[PDB]
């Protein structure tokens, strides 16, 4: 026999004694070690004392699991552990003061999201995401990336869209204080004003330019081509997206941006960030230039409180 700790959150640990002739699956249920599925594996001697993740099998663990992850999905733990099994093997080099990811397993979109998250103000609601976020900012991002995959219901190797990943992540973050007031001007119908809250207040699809959004954009009306423009914005940042197209990025006019090259779904992302000059982060690779023209699909801008001056 050996003694071990079981857990669902790696915080509340539960002391357990195992029989060395019985696989973990028969004694605990699905059991994992550092992401590795050890369900159908018998206890070893090097396994003495180590802490194992277990799928919740009593009410105490179910409550602990929800409090840490904010999900009751019985598949979440296994998807998380399956991702972690790869992400713990990726490299996370510091590039220009930011934790990036060396290229592997189609992770370019994850590197771009990871880099963006280090440059905008965000509070995640699940303790598991917040804790991993902090550790990620300090260079240890394997767990954060695994969690991103599990929360986005994506698997290692799958082809990911950065805008969609950020949107999923935003939905697990505290964006309640975020507010966007819009005004639509139709010649026949008139003037209608809507207010958005949460994730919808910080994201727009249609143009990369925050200025253009403030000046107004052409959207078809219910009557059938009105104009929508930003009336008031209340958020620490905004994300502007558009299908990839050549675009000029000017130093000091944006926080950071997603560059996307190639075919729909199987292309490659790079990350552009505005520091004292423009830096391009391609996984572990870093280039700099005073101007930038290229195929851009997301642009992030800082914000606090904006009210329009249109009467």
Ligand X SMILES: Cc1ccc(N2C[C@H]3CC[C@@H](C2)N3C)cc1C(=O)N[C@H](C)c1cc(-c2cnn(C)c2)nc2ccccc12
- Binding-site members for Zn(2+) are 186, 189, 221, 223
- Count of residues engaged in binding Cl ion, rule: CB under 5 A: 7
From the candidates 86, 108, 145, 172, give the one annotated as an active-site residue. Answer: 108
- The verdict on 190 binding ligand X (CB under 6 A) reads no
Q: Is 160 in the site for ligand X (CB under 6 A)?
A: yes
251 is a contact residue toward Zn ion (CB under 5 A): yes
Between the alpha carbon of residue 92 and those of residues 107, 124, 136, 174, the distances in Å are: 12, 21, 9, 27
CA gap 159, 106 in Å, rounded = 6
Among the listed ranges 60-68, 125-133, 159-167, 277-285, the one in contact with ligand X (CB under 6 A) is 159-167
Sequence ranges of the binding site: 186, 189, 221, 223
Q: Whole-number minimum distance, CB 241 to ligand X, in Å?
A: 7
Catalytic residue at 34? no
Question: Min. distance of Cβ 305 from Zn ion in angstroms?
Answer: 25
Nearest to residue 168, comparing CAs of 119, 212, 242, 109? 109
Q: Least CB distance from residue 273 to ligand X, whole Å?
A: 18
Residue 260 binding: pick among Cl ion, ligand X, Zn ion, none (C-beta 5-8 Å cut-off by kind):
ligand X
Residue from 36, 181, 221, 242 touching Zn ion (CB under 5 A): that is 221
Rounded least distance, CB 271 to ligand X, Å: 13
Contact residues for 171 (Cβ-Cβ < 8 A; gap 6+): 199
Closest listed residue to residue 34, CA positions, set 72, 86, 91, 71: 86
- Residue 27 has phi, psi (to 5 degrees) of -95, -40
- Active site includes 47? no
Using CB under 5 A, which of the segments 17-25, 81-89, 145-153, 258-266 binds Cl ion?
81-89
Q: In 28-106, which ranges are continuous DSSP H helix? A: 59-69, 76-87
Interface with Zn ion, residue 7, by CB under 5 A: no
Does 283 interact with ligand X (rule: CB under 6 A)?
A: no
**At CA 236, angle to CA 133 and CA 159, rounded to 5?**
50
b or e along 175-207 (b: 16 or more beta carbons within 10 Å of the residue's beta carbon)? beebbbbbbbebeeeeeeeeebebbebbbbeee
Closer to Cl ion by CB, 201 or 226: give it. Answer: 201
Candidate residues 161, 259, 282, 303; the one interacting with ligand X per rule CB under 6 A: 161
Q: Which is nearer to Cl ion, 260 or 301 (CB)?
A: 260
Cβ atoms of 243 and 225 closer than 8 Å: no
**Would you call 248 exposed, middle or buried from its count of C-beta atoms within 10 A (0-12, 13-18, 19+)?**
exposed
- Chosen residue from 51, 72, 125, 195 binding Zn ion by CB under 5 A: 125
* 3 near Cl ion (CB under 5 A): no
Name which position in 3, 89, 197, 250 contacts Cl ion (CB under 5 A): 89
- CA separation for the pair 273, 99 (Å, rounded): 13
Give the count of beta carbons closer than 10 Å to the beta carbon of residue 38.
22
Q: Which stretch binds Cl ion (CB under 5 A): 167-175, 181-189, 236-244, 254-262?
A: 167-175
Q: Give the separation between CA 22 and CA 41, rounded to whole angstroms.
A: 8
Q: Which residues bind ligand X (CB under 6 A)?
A: 159-161, 164, 243-244, 260, 264-265, 267, 297
Q: Which residues are catalytic?
A: 108, 268, 282
Q: Which residues bind Cl ion (CB under 5 A)?
A: 70, 86, 89, 103, 108, 125, 172
């Amino acid at each position: 026999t050996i003694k071990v700790f079981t857990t669902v959150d790696n915080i509340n640990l539960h002391t357990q004694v195992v029989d060395m002739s019985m696989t973990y699956g028969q004694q605990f249920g699905p059991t994992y070690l550092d992401g590795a599925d050890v369900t159908k594996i018998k206890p070893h001697n090097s396994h003495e004392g180590k802490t194992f993740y277990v799928l919740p099998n009593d009410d105490t663990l179910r409550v602990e699991a929800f409090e840490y992850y904010h999900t009751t999905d019985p598949s979440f733990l296994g998807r998380y552990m399956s991702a972690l099994n790869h992400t713990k093997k990726w490299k996370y080099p510091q590039v220009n003061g930011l934790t990036s990811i060396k290229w592997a397993d189609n992770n370019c979109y994850l590197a771009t999201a990871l880099l963006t998250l280090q440059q905008i103000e965000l509070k995640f609601n699940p303790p598991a995401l917040q804790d991993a976020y902090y550790r990620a900012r300090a260079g240890e991002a394997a767990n954060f990336c695994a969690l991103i995959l599990a929360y986005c219901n994506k698997t290692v190797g799958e082809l990911g869209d950065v805008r969609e990943t950020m949107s999923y992540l935003f939905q697990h973050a505290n964006l309640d204080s975020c507010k966007r007031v819009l005004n639509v001007v139709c010649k026949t119908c008139g003037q209608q004003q809507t207010t958005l809250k949460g994730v919808e207040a910080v994201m727009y699809m249609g143009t990369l330019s925050y200025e253009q959004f403030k000046k107004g954009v052409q959207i078809p009306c219910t009557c059938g081509q009105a104009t929508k423009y930003l009336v008031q914005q209340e958020s620490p940042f905004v994300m502007m997206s558009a299908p990839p197209a050549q675009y000029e990025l000017k130093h000091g006019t944006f926080t950071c941006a997603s560059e996307y090259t190639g075919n729909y779904q199987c292309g490659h992302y790079k990350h552009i960030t505005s520091k004292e000059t423009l830096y391009c982060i391609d996984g572990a690779l870093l280039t700099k230039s005073s101007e930038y023209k290229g195929p851009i699909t997301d642009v992030f801008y800082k914000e606090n409180s904006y009210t329009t001056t249109i009467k």
